[PDB]
């Protein structure tokens, strides 16, 4: 027994509980995402590999991508905790190959929100990856403003 | 391309491919000296066309 067995608290309380403690193993599965849309091409692994902490140690539960939420969508692309980004950045001097390990100590809670909705109030009743802005933003060719809040708390 | 336009405008660019189908036919010549002959002309007519194309 290292997981509970279901018992009642009082005579006919009608209660049954257990307890499950979780983790992620950092994965290495090298997934290069082809992007010809922007020069920067980006390899994000399969977004950690979720595991259960029993006995003090991780025993896998498989791809943590489809498990966990949220992930940023680099044109859809699921980037979340427990990955590595191998980065090919460009400049007028040429290019450099950098690497940034994507940690959950790099997770960063940022919402991007509309001009007319508050920055620090999110929208859970609007879809997670979408909200339809209904406000008019007029563009003028010397003042081309796409106004949003990049809420960097 | 999977432009999965759900909540996300997800732009994937999945390449796929196709190999054409070509046929190759070989012909060989030998004699009574058991040595393979060089210089022999052999002519393949495509005779499934209803003439000697």
């Amino acid at each position: 027994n290292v997981l509970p067995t279901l018992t009642e608290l009082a005579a006919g309380n009608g209660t049954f509980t257990g307890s499950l403690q979780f983790t992620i193993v950092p994965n290495n599965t090298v997934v290069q995402i082809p992007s010809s849309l922007t020069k920067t091409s980006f390899a994000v692994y399969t977004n950690g590999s979720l595991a259960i902490v029993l006995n003090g140690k991780a025993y896998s539960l498989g791809p943590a991508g489809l498990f966990l939420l949220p992930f940023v969508t680099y044109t859809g692309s699921a980037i979340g905790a427990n990955a590595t980004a191998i980065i090919t950045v460009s400049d007028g001097v040429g290019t450099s190959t950098t690497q940034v390990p994507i940690t959950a100590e790099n997770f960063t809670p940022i919402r991007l929100a509309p001009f007319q909705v508050p920055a620090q109030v999110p929208l859970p009743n609007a879809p997670k990856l979408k909200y339809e802005y209904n406000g008019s933003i007029v563009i003028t060719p010397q003042q081309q403003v796409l106004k949003i809040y990049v809420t960097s708390i | 391309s999977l432009s999965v336009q759900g909540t996300t405008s997800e732009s994937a660019s999945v390449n796929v491919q196709y190999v054409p189908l070509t046929s190759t036919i070989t012909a060989t010549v030998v004699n009574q000296e058991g040595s393979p002959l060089a210089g022999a002309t052999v002519q393949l007519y495509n005779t499934t066309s209803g003439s000697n194309t």
Binding site: A78 | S11, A12, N15, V16, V19, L21
Partner: peptide, 29 residues
């Protein structure tokens, strides 16, 4: 399975070659 630009492609994964009369099936998460 492989996360190409958000679509968890079980099929197609890039550079997948086909044959005369072969059925592509689009299996995607």
């Amino acid at each position: 399975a492989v996360t190409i630009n958000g679509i968890t492609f079980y099929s197609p994964v890039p550079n997948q070659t086909y044959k005369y009369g072969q059925q592509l099936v689009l299996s995607i998460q």
